[PDB]
Amino acid sequence: RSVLKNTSVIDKIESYVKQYKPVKIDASKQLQVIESFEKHAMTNAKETESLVSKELKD
Amino acid sequence: VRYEASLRQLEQRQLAKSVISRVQSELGNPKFQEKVLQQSISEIEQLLSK
Amino acid sequence: EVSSILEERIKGVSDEANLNETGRVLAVGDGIARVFGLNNIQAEELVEFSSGVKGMALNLEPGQVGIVLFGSDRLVKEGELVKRTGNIVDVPVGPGLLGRVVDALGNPIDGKGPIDAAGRSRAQVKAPGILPRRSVHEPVQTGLKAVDALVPIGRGQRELIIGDRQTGKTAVALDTILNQKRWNNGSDESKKLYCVYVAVGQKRSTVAQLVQTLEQHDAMKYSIIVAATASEAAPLQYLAPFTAASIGEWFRDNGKHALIVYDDLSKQAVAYRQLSLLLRRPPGREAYPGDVFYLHSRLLERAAKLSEKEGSGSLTALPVIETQGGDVSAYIPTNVISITDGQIFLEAELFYKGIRPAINVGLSVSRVGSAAQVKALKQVAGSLKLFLAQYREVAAFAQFGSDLDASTKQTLVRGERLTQLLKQNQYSPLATEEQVPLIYAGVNGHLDGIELSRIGEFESSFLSYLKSNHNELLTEIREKGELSKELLASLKSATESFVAT
Numbered sequence: 001r002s003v004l005k006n007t008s009v010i011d012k013i014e015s016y017v018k019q020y021k022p023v024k025i026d027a028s029k030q031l032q033v034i035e036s037f038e039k040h041a042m043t044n045a046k047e048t049e050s051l052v053s054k055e056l057k058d
Numbered sequence: 059v060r061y062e063a064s065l066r067q068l069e070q071r072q073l074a075k076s077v078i079s080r081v082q083s084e085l086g087n088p089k090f091q092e093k094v095l096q097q098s099i100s101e102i103e104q105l106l107s108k
Numbered sequence: 109e110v111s112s113i114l115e116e117r118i119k120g121v122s123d124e125a126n127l128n129e130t131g132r133v134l135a136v137g138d139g140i141a142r143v144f145g146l147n148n149i150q151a152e153e154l155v156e157f158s159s160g161v162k163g164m165a166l167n168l169e170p171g172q173v174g175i176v177l178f179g180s181d182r183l184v185k186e187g188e189l190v191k192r193t194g195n196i197v198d199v200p201v202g203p204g205l206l207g208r209v210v211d212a213l214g215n216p217i218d219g220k221g222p223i224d225a226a227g228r229s230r231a232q233v234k235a236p237g238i239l240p241r242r243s244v245h246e247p248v249q250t251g252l253k254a255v256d257a258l259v260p261i262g263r264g265q266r267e268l269i270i271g272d273r274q275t276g277k278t279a280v281a282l283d284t285i286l287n288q289k290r291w292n293n294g295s296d297e298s299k300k301l302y303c304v305y306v307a308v309g310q311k312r313s314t315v316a317q318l319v320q321t322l323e324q325h326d327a328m329k330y331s332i333i334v335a336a337t338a339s340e341a342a343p344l345q346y347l348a349p350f351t352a353a354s355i356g357e358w359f360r361d362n363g364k365h366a367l368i369v370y371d372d373l374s375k376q377a378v379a380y381r382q383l384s385l386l387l388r389r390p391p392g393r394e395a396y397p398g399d400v401f402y403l404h405s406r407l408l409e410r411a412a413k414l415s416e417k418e419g420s421g422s423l424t425a426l427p428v429i430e431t432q433g434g435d436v437s438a439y440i441p442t443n444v445i446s447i448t449d450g451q452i453f454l455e456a457e458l459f460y461k462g463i464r465p466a467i468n469v470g471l472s473v474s475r476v477g478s479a480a481q482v483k484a485l486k487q488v489a490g491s492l493k494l495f496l497a498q499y500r501e502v503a504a505f506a507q508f509g510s511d512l513d514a515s516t517k518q519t520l521v522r523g524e525r526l527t528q529l530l531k532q533n534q535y536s537p538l539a540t541e542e543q544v545p546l547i548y549a550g551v552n553g554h555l556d557g558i559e560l561s562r563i564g565e566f567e568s569s570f571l572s573y574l575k576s577n578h579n580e581l582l583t584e585i586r587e588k589g590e591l592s593k594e595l596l597a598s599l600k601s602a603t604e605s606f607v608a609t
Contacts, residue, residue, distance in 0.1 A: 006062045070111055104124050 125191060133157070133188040135172065139181050139341065140386040142172040143190050149173055152232070154193040159183050164197055164343060167387050174387055176343040178213075199351045200225030201358035206302060209319055209333040212344040212351055217335065218319070229354040231347060235409035242415040247480050248301065248367065248424060251287025251537025252465055254530045257489045257547065258496075259452055259472050262480025263301075263365055263422035264413030268444055270429045270436075271454030271466075278318065279534055280454060280465055281305075281369050281428060285327060287537035288367070292330045301424070302359050302366045304332045306352040308345055309375030312337045321535070345379040353410050356423045363419035368411060371428040373404060377440045394439040401443045408447050450474040463531060469496055482540060483590040488547045492526070495551070499523025522556045528563040529555065541586040545574055548591075549603045557607070570606055578602045 001010035084090070131145020141163060146155070149165060155175050156162045161184050167174035177184060200214045204224025211217045214225075244262040261267060261284070269280055282305075291299040305322075307315050315335050322328040334355060336348035349370055359366040377396050384397035392398035411425035429444050434456070436445070445451065453471035478486050502519040506512060512520065529550050532538060546567060549555050558566055574582055581598050585591070591599065 004059050004062060066110060069109070073111055100124070108126065 127189070127191045129192045130189045131173065133184065133186055133190065136181060136184055136186060138386045139177050139179075139343075140174065140383075141177050141181070141184060142169075142174045144172045146173045146175075146190070146192060149192060150194075150196055152196050154195060154197050155190050156193055157184055157190045158188050159185070162193070164347065166383070167389075176383060176387070178341050178344050180341075197231045197347065197351070198228045199231070199354055200227070201229045201355050202226035205332040205355055206330060207328055207332075209315070209335055212334075212336050212340065212348050214351075218333075227358065229357065231350040231354060232406070233354060233357060233410065235406065236412040236414055236418075240415045240418045241412050242418075242420065244413045244422075244476060244480050246365065246413070246420075246422065247482050248284075249287060249482070249540045250284040251290075251540065251543075252283055252532055253538060253543040253546065254465060254467055254532070255284075255452070256481070256485060256540060256543065257492060258467065258469055259450055259474035260478055260481035260485075261424070261426075261474075262413075262476060263367075263424045264411060265450065265476045265480065266408050266411055266425045266427060266448045267450030267452055267474065267476075268427050268429055268448040269371075269452045269454065270431055270441065270445070272434050272456040273430050273432070275454060275456055275459050275466065276464075276534060277428065277430060277454070278310075278314075278371060280452075281371055281426060282318070282321070283465070283535070283537050284367075284426070285322070285331065285369065286325055286535070288330070289325065289327050290539060292327075297364065300364060302330055302332070302364060303327075304334060304352060304356050304359075304366060304368045306334045306349060306368060306370050308336050308348050308370075308372065309338050309378070310335075310371075312339070325535075342379045342382045346376065346383050349373070349376055349407050353407060357410065360414065360421045360423040363414075363421045365422045365424070367424040367426065369426045369428065370407075372430050373427050373444065374430040374432075374440060376404075396440055400440065401447075404444060405447050449476045463527060464534060465532060467530075470500065482544075484544050484585060484588075485540065485547070487591055488544055488551055490551070492547065492551055495519070495522060495526060499526065518556075522553065524560055525555050525558065525563055526550055528560060529567065531564075541582055542571055542574070544585050544591070545578075545582070545599060545603070546570065548599050552600065552603060554603050554607050566609075569609065573606050574602065 001014070004010050129146050129148050131143040133141055133143050135142045141157065143155075146165075149155075149168060151165070151168060153165050154162055155165055157175070157177070157179075161177050161179035161181075163175045163177040163179070165173055165175040175190065199212075200223050202223065202225035204226075208216050208220055208223060209218035210223060214223055216223060241264075244264050246263040248261040248263055249256055250261055255261070259267065269277070271277065285303050285305060288301050288303055292301065292303075294300075305318075307318070315333070315337060319328065319333055322331055322333075332355060334348065334352040336345045352368065352370070356366055356368045377400055380400055380403060381392075381396050385391060385395070389397055392400065408425060408427060411423040414421035427444060427448060429441055431441050432438065435441065451471060451473050453468045454466050455468035455471070456466070458468060459466035481489075498519045499522070502512075502516050502523060505516065506520060529546065549570065555563065555566065578598065581595070581602060584595055584598075588595065
């Protein structure tokens with residue numbers, strides 16, 4: 001702004017930047033599906049573990 | 059910024075052509091006579107100081 | 109605005125001249141004026157023609173003093189008066205030249221405002237004497253492993269880069285400048301080389317690309333660019349190396365070490381030819397005036413490692429000569445070859461062969477030798493010279509393709525891998541601390557086994573591996589700069605470990 005002599009367009013785009021300080025909407029996009037997949041998967045992990053643990057002792 | 063710098067150069071060349079216009083004005087006037095007298099007497103003072 | 113202050117300054121230049129010498133232009137043409145008068149006139153003097161053209165004066169004749177214009181004669185006209193500046197040609201010299209492109213008369217042509225100048229100096233300055241010189245003992249690492257190994261660069265040395273036209277000719281030199289980023293960025297002033305790249309005869313676009321490249325690698329923050337583009341006058345081109353030299357001398361004088369690249373002197377010779385033949389001087393050998401050797405020699409001898417009483421100053425020079433058709437018997441190439449202390453022959457065939465940087469190792473010498481080679485790097489590359497020499501001999505026999513004996517093929521196999529080892533990517537020099545391992549591996553024959561195709565892969569990986577594990581070792585190579593028994597063993601083990609990857 002101290003470079004640009006041509007007035008009040010640096011203040012404009014500075015203020016436009018301060019307008020657009022907000023960002024696109026989005027958060028946790030999986031918290032039901034990540035948990036659901038993990039649940040089904042976890043069950044399967046335990047199934048494998050229990051089978052092989054039994055077999056190990058056998 | 060780029061156009062601003064360009065505009066300063068543009069202003070300078072515009073004002074340059076005004077110097078040309080002013081040059082024609084000076085050499086037209088009997089300033090053409092009167093400043094020659096000034097130069098003449100200045101040479102008298104200077105060359106006498108040699 | 110800015111205009112009002114400029115006009116005020118302009119108004120502020122008045123005050124009559126006493127013009128103690130005059131002379132009337134008469135024979136003027138070809139940009140080479142000859143004026144009648146100038147009874148007082150120093151030789152090599154700068155004379156302001158009344159038309160805003162300034163021209164130095166190189167011939168004093170008992171008729172007409174021949175003042176070579178620095179401008180175009182389309183602003184000069186017959187019978188003008190000329191007023192002797194009364195100062196033999198001089199340039200501003202200072203620290204402010206760092207990060208500036210400047211034309212011959214020291215006007216910033218990159219227009220980064222007026223040069224911050226700590227002095228002015230004169231174009232011709234006599235070379236450092238025998239007495240104020242001490243022997244070279246300070247390496248300069250170009251970051252091109254082949255260069256460092258084969259033709260080591262020191263400070264105060266003159267080594268001629270010679271070879272076929274613009275075979276990235278500029279780029280070979282530019283790499284050296286780029287590797288000086290490592291020390292330069294560093295605060296060790298005893299390892300600070302301020303770099304002056306002199307560009308004579310090149311078009312503005314070429315120069316502009318180069319300065320941009322330098323800005324891209326952000327190396328322009330230690331570079332001085334002296335330029336004399338091909339548009340600019342033949343007298344200014346002739347004067348251009350000598351005014352670069354003085355700019356260098358300010359660094360040299362300060363004791364600060366520096367390096368001046370004079371690219372390309374071959375165009376200086378053309379310029380001096382034009383100048384001389386339109387000063388009507390008798391045509392020299394091969395049409396280049398016979399005093400070109402003197403011209404080039406006086407220029408070249410001003411780079412030196414000044415004595416320790418002279419604060420160990422050192423301007424280092426790298427001249428660059430384009431060989432037209434690779435003719436090494438041409439008068440201008442012959443003259444330069446004698447003057448310099450090294451040859452760094454670049455061979456086109458090897459360039460095409462894909463050995464880039466391309467160096468014909470037989471036509472490359474460093475007559476100032478390994479006194480300026482890194483002590484560690486001397487140990488590792490000890491038999492590299494022998495191996496390569498053997499490779500050359502072996503390769504010649506191999507052309508005939510006679511069934512080679514195993515001894516010949518040991519050499520052949522080793523040699524092939526070495527050649528691939530030498531190769532490096534243009535515009536990407538490598539750190540010497542990490543070039544010492546690569547040469548150790550090669551010389552200790554570990555790479556001789558490794559298949560030729562994957563040498564390039566191996567090199568990359570080896571560096572990654574040393575970065576991973578033997579980074580303690582790398583630090584030591586930098587720090588101690590001589591490979592001790594422990595370092596040699598560590599390095600030997602590391603390389604051995606990495607043989608199978």
